[PDB]
Short mmCIF file of C-alpha atoms and ligand atoms in Angstrom, two decimals:
data_model
loop_
_atom_site.label_atom_id
_atom_site.label_comp_id
_atom_site.label_asym_id
_atom_site.label_seq_id
_atom_site.Cartn_x
_atom_site.Cartn_y
_atom_site.Cartn_z
CA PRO H 1 4.66 0.66 18.37
CA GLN H 2 0.98 0.21 17.64
CA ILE H 3 0.18 2.54 14.70
CA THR H 4 -3.44 3.63 13.94
CA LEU H 5 -4.28 4.66 10.40
CA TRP H 6 -5.99 8.10 10.78
CA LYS H 7 -2.90 9.47 9.09
CA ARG H 8 -0.34 8.02 6.72
CA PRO H 9 1.85 5.57 8.64
CA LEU H 10 5.19 7.43 8.14
CA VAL H 11 8.24 6.41 10.13
CA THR H 12 11.90 7.45 10.31
CA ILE H 13 14.41 5.31 8.42
CA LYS H 14 18.16 5.55 8.35
CA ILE H 15 19.84 4.35 5.19
CA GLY H 16 23.30 5.06 3.79
CA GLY H 17 24.08 7.46 6.63
CA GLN H 18 20.91 9.48 5.77
CA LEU H 19 17.64 10.12 7.58
CA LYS H 20 14.40 9.81 5.67
CA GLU H 21 10.68 9.38 6.20
CA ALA H 22 8.99 6.36 4.72
CA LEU H 23 5.53 4.85 4.50
CA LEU H 24 4.84 1.42 6.04
CA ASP H 25 3.00 -0.15 3.18
CA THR H 26 1.20 -3.52 3.37
CA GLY H 27 0.18 -3.20 -0.31
CA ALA H 28 3.79 -3.10 -1.54
CA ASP H 29 5.61 -6.41 -2.35
CA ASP H 30 8.93 -4.51 -2.40
CA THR H 31 10.68 -1.54 -0.80
CA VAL H 32 11.03 1.45 -3.09
CA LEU H 33 12.95 4.58 -2.20
CA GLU H 34 13.30 7.88 -3.99
CA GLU H 35 16.51 8.60 -5.94
CA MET H 36 19.58 8.43 -3.74
CA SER H 37 23.14 7.16 -4.10
CA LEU H 38 23.81 3.75 -2.74
CA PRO H 39 27.19 2.07 -2.86
CA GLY H 40 27.32 -1.21 -4.80
CA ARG H 41 26.38 -3.03 -7.99
CA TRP H 42 22.71 -3.18 -9.08
CA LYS H 43 20.27 -4.84 -11.49
CA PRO H 44 17.52 -3.15 -13.56
CA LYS H 45 13.98 -4.08 -12.54
CA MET H 46 10.41 -3.01 -13.41
CA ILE H 47 7.62 -2.53 -10.87
CA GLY H 48 3.94 -1.85 -11.43
CA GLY H 49 1.19 0.02 -9.70
CA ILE H 50 -1.85 2.23 -10.31
CA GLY H 51 -1.36 4.02 -13.65
CA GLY H 52 1.43 1.78 -14.89
CA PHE H 53 5.03 0.48 -14.61
CA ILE H 54 8.34 2.24 -13.66
CA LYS H 55 11.99 1.20 -14.04
CA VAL H 56 14.00 1.00 -10.82
CA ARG H 57 17.47 0.02 -9.64
CA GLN H 58 17.72 -3.01 -7.42
CA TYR H 59 20.24 -3.23 -4.56
CA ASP H 60 20.67 -6.38 -2.42
CA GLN H 61 21.85 -6.82 1.16
CA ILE H 62 21.21 -3.20 2.08
CA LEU H 63 21.11 -2.25 5.78
CA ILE H 64 18.10 -0.15 6.83
CA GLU H 65 17.04 1.08 10.22
CA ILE H 66 13.20 1.36 10.42
CA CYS H 67 12.15 3.03 13.64
CA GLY H 68 15.28 1.79 15.45
CA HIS H 69 14.84 -1.78 14.10
CA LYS H 70 17.68 -2.98 11.84
CA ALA H 71 16.84 -5.03 8.74
CA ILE H 72 18.96 -6.21 5.78
CA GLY H 73 17.25 -6.54 2.42
CA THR H 74 16.64 -5.69 -1.19
CA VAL H 75 15.86 -2.07 -1.70
CA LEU H 76 14.68 -0.60 -5.01
CA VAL H 77 15.53 2.95 -6.01
CA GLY H 78 13.76 5.02 -8.61
CA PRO H 79 11.24 7.73 -9.38
CA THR H 80 8.68 7.23 -6.62
CA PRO H 81 7.08 10.30 -4.98
CA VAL H 82 7.26 8.73 -1.52
CA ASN H 83 9.63 6.33 0.18
CA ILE H 84 7.94 2.89 0.53
CA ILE H 85 8.72 0.16 3.05
CA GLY H 86 7.20 -2.97 1.51
CA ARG H 87 6.51 -6.47 2.78
CA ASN H 88 10.02 -7.86 2.19
CA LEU H 89 11.21 -5.64 5.07
CA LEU H 90 8.00 -5.44 7.15
CA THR H 91 8.28 -9.23 7.85
CA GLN H 92 11.84 -8.73 9.12
CA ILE H 93 10.80 -6.22 11.76
CA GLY H 94 7.87 -8.44 12.85
CA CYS H 95 5.20 -6.10 11.56
CA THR H 96 1.52 -7.40 11.67
CA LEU H 97 -1.93 -6.00 10.86
CA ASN H 98 -4.49 -6.31 13.64
CA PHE H 99 -8.22 -5.79 13.84
CA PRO J 1 -7.39 -11.46 13.22
CA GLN J 2 -3.69 -10.84 13.45
CA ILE J 3 -2.31 -10.90 9.89
CA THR J 4 1.44 -11.51 9.16
CA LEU J 5 2.90 -10.22 5.91
CA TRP J 6 4.71 -13.26 4.42
CA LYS J 7 2.01 -13.16 1.78
CA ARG J 8 -0.23 -10.44 0.42
CA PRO J 9 -2.83 -9.55 3.05
CA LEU J 10 -5.96 -10.54 1.01
CA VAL J 11 -9.31 -10.79 2.69
CA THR J 12 -12.91 -11.56 1.64
CA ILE J 13 -15.19 -8.54 1.12
CA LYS J 14 -18.89 -8.50 0.27
CA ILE J 15 -20.12 -5.51 -1.67
CA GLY J 16 -23.29 -5.07 -3.76
CA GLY J 17 -24.36 -8.67 -3.14
CA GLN J 18 -20.99 -9.87 -4.54
CA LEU J 19 -18.01 -11.66 -3.00
CA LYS J 20 -14.54 -10.42 -3.76
CA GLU J 21 -10.97 -10.61 -2.50
CA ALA J 22 -9.24 -7.38 -1.57
CA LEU J 23 -5.84 -6.28 -0.30
CA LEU J 24 -5.63 -4.55 3.10
CA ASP J 25 -3.44 -1.66 2.09
CA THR J 26 -1.89 0.79 4.60
CA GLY J 27 -0.27 2.72 1.68
CA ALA J 28 -3.64 3.61 0.16
CA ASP J 29 -5.47 6.82 1.22
CA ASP J 30 -8.63 5.52 -0.50
CA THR J 31 -10.48 2.32 -1.31
CA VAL J 32 -10.27 1.31 -4.96
CA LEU J 33 -12.18 -1.57 -6.51
CA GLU J 34 -12.04 -3.12 -9.95
CA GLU J 35 -14.88 -2.32 -12.39
CA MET J 36 -18.26 -3.35 -11.07
CA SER J 37 -21.77 -1.95 -11.15
CA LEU J 38 -22.78 0.00 -8.11
CA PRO J 39 -26.23 1.54 -7.74
CA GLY J 40 -26.22 5.33 -7.26
CA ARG J 41 -24.91 8.68 -8.47
CA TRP J 42 -21.13 9.25 -8.73
CA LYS J 43 -18.44 11.89 -9.12
CA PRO J 44 -15.32 11.69 -11.34
CA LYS J 45 -12.03 11.62 -9.43
CA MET J 46 -8.32 11.09 -10.22
CA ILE J 47 -5.93 9.04 -8.09
CA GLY J 48 -2.20 8.65 -8.36
CA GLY J 49 0.35 5.96 -7.76
CA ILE J 50 3.56 4.45 -9.04
CA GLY J 51 3.73 5.06 -12.82
CA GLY J 52 1.02 7.71 -12.91
CA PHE J 53 -2.62 8.59 -12.50
CA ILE J 54 -5.97 6.99 -13.28
CA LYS J 55 -9.56 8.25 -13.52
CA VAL J 56 -12.06 6.52 -11.20
CA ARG J 57 -15.71 6.82 -10.21
CA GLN J 58 -16.44 7.84 -6.67
CA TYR J 59 -19.39 6.41 -4.72
CA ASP J 60 -20.35 7.62 -1.21
CA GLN J 61 -22.05 5.83 1.67
CA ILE J 62 -21.43 2.37 0.27
CA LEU J 63 -21.82 -0.61 2.59
CA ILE J 64 -18.94 -3.06 2.55
CA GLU J 65 -18.33 -6.11 4.65
CA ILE J 66 -14.55 -6.68 5.21
CA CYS J 67 -13.95 -10.00 6.86
CA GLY J 68 -17.35 -9.99 8.58
CA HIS J 69 -16.92 -6.37 9.79
CA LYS J 70 -19.40 -3.88 8.30
CA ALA J 71 -18.22 -0.41 7.26
CA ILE J 72 -19.90 2.44 5.32
CA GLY J 73 -17.74 4.65 3.16
CA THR J 74 -16.50 6.11 -0.04
CA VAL J 75 -15.46 3.50 -2.51
CA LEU J 76 -13.69 4.32 -5.78
CA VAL J 77 -14.22 2.17 -8.85
CA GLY J 78 -11.88 2.03 -11.82
CA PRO J 79 -9.18 0.20 -13.74
CA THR J 80 -7.13 -1.26 -10.90
CA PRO J 81 -5.64 -4.75 -11.25
CA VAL J 82 -6.41 -5.60 -7.62
CA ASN J 83 -9.15 -4.59 -5.20
CA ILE J 84 -7.72 -2.19 -2.57
CA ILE J 85 -9.05 -1.54 0.92
CA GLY J 86 -7.47 1.81 1.88
CA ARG J 87 -7.16 3.74 5.13
CA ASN J 88 -10.61 5.39 4.95
CA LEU J 89 -12.11 1.96 5.69
CA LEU J 90 -9.27 0.37 7.67
CA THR J 91 -9.86 3.00 10.44
CA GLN J 92 -13.54 1.99 10.57
CA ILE J 93 -12.78 -1.64 11.25
CA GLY J 94 -10.18 -0.74 13.92
CA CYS J 95 -7.21 -1.97 11.95
CA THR J 96 -3.69 -1.15 13.34
CA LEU J 97 -0.07 -1.93 12.42
CA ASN J 98 2.00 -3.52 15.17
CA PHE J 99 5.68 -4.25 15.62
C1 3TL F 101 4.52 0.62 -4.50
C2 3TL F 101 4.49 -0.41 -5.63
C3 3TL F 101 5.73 -1.29 -5.55
C4 3TL F 101 3.21 -1.25 -5.62
N1 3TL F 101 3.27 -2.24 -6.69
C5 3TL F 101 3.50 -3.55 -6.53
O1 3TL F 101 3.66 -4.06 -5.43
C6 3TL F 101 3.56 -4.36 -7.81
C7 3TL F 101 2.43 -5.37 -7.86
N2 3TL F 101 4.83 -5.04 -7.92
C8 3TL F 101 5.48 -5.34 -9.04
O2 3TL F 101 5.50 -4.67 -10.06
O3 3TL F 101 6.21 -6.58 -9.04
C9 3TL F 101 6.97 -7.04 -10.17
C10 3TL F 101 6.10 -7.46 -11.33
C11 3TL F 101 6.69 -7.70 -12.58
C12 3TL F 101 5.92 -8.08 -13.68
C13 3TL F 101 4.54 -8.22 -13.52
C14 3TL F 101 3.94 -7.98 -12.28
C15 3TL F 101 4.72 -7.60 -11.19
C16 3TL F 101 1.97 -0.40 -5.75
O4 3TL F 101 1.93 0.53 -6.54
N3 3TL F 101 0.94 -0.74 -4.97
C17 3TL F 101 -0.35 -0.05 -4.90
C18 3TL F 101 -1.52 -0.97 -5.28
C19 3TL F 101 -1.40 -1.56 -6.66
C20 3TL F 101 -0.60 -2.67 -6.91
C21 3TL F 101 -0.51 -3.23 -8.18
C22 3TL F 101 -1.24 -2.64 -9.21
C23 3TL F 101 -2.06 -1.53 -8.97
C24 3TL F 101 -2.14 -0.99 -7.69
C25 3TL F 101 -0.61 0.40 -3.47
O5 3TL F 101 -0.80 -0.78 -2.72
C26 3TL F 101 0.51 1.19 -2.79
O6 3TL F 101 0.24 1.16 -1.41
C27 3TL F 101 0.66 2.64 -3.25
C28 3TL F 101 1.93 3.24 -2.61
C29 3TL F 101 2.05 4.70 -2.95
C30 3TL F 101 1.64 5.68 -2.05
C31 3TL F 101 1.76 7.04 -2.36
C32 3TL F 101 2.28 7.41 -3.60
C33 3TL F 101 2.68 6.43 -4.51
C34 3TL F 101 2.58 5.08 -4.19
N4 3TL F 101 -0.54 3.44 -2.97
C35 3TL F 101 -1.33 3.94 -3.93
O7 3TL F 101 -1.05 3.89 -5.12
C36 3TL F 101 -2.61 4.60 -3.48
N5 3TL F 101 -2.59 6.03 -3.71
C37 3TL F 101 -2.81 6.92 -2.73
O8 3TL F 101 -3.26 6.60 -1.64
C38 3TL F 101 -2.48 8.35 -3.06
C39 3TL F 101 -1.15 8.73 -2.43
N6 3TL F 101 -3.50 9.31 -2.70
C40 3TL F 101 -4.20 9.92 -3.66
O9 3TL F 101 -4.12 9.62 -4.83
O10 3TL F 101 -5.13 10.98 -3.30
C41 3TL F 101 -5.71 11.87 -4.27
C42 3TL F 101 -4.76 12.89 -4.89
C43 3TL F 101 -5.20 13.69 -5.96
C44 3TL F 101 -4.37 14.64 -6.55
C45 3TL F 101 -3.07 14.79 -6.09
C46 3TL F 101 -2.61 14.01 -5.04
C47 3TL F 101 -3.46 13.06 -4.44
C48 3TL F 101 -3.87 4.01 -4.15
C49 3TL F 101 -3.90 2.49 -4.08
C50 3TL F 101 -5.15 4.53 -3.52
#
C-alpha cells in the first residue's frame, strides 16, 4: 500500500493469535505494544519519549503479521496508549517514506 | 526523495533564519521543535506521549523549509529532545509511506 498521512497511519496486526490495530511510526526506534500476554522469557528495558521514560518488557524473535506481511523481531510490551510499529520492523516489511 | 528506515529519518529544516535537523515522524499528530525564539503571539498547549505530557507553545502560520520544500503551518515549541516534523506538515509536502 501507499499510505497518505491525513489520518493516523493505523494498520491491522496479528500477534499471538490476536488481532490489533497499530500505528506505523517512523519516529519510533522500537516496536511497543500495549499490555498483552506473550509466551517466552523476557528482559526489562527502559524507553523514552515526550514527557519521560517508561519500563517495558522485551521479547525477542516474536512473529508479527503487519498488513499481511510477516516479520520476526523484538517487540516491547508495556504501558503505551497505542500500539507502535517502530523502525526495527518497518525495515523488514520494506517500508519507505516518499515525497 | 525515497527514505529507507535503517536509520532515523532526519532531514534539514530551515526555520526563522536557522538551520536544524528534524525527524520525519509519522507517529506525531503535530510538529514539535526544541526551544527557539519565534517571532509572534502564541497559545499554551499540552501534548502527550510515552511517559506523559508536556506543555508547549503553539505558533500558527509559521514558514518552514523541509528538505527544500516550503510549508506553512502550526509549529509547537517546547522541551523535546529532538525536533519532530509531524503529520500536519508531512501532508503539505506530499509525504507518503510505502510498502
Ligand atoms: C514510541 C517511543 C518508543 C519513542 N521513543 C524512542 O524511540 C526513544 C528515543 N527510544 C528509547 O528510549 O531508546 C532507548 C534509550 C535508552 C537510554 C537513553 C536513550 C534511549 C517516542 O516516544 N517517540 C516520539 C518522539 C520522541 C522521541 C524521543 C524523545 C522525545 C520524543 C514520537 O516519535 C512517537 O512517534 C510518538 C508515538 C506515540 C503516539 C501516540 C501516543 C503515544 C506515543 N508520538 C508522539 O509522542 C507525538 N504525540 C502525538 O502525536 C499525540 C498522540 N497527539 C497529541 O498529543 O494531541 C493532543 C492531545 C491533547 C490532549 C489529549 C490527547 C491528545 C508527539 C511527538 C507529537
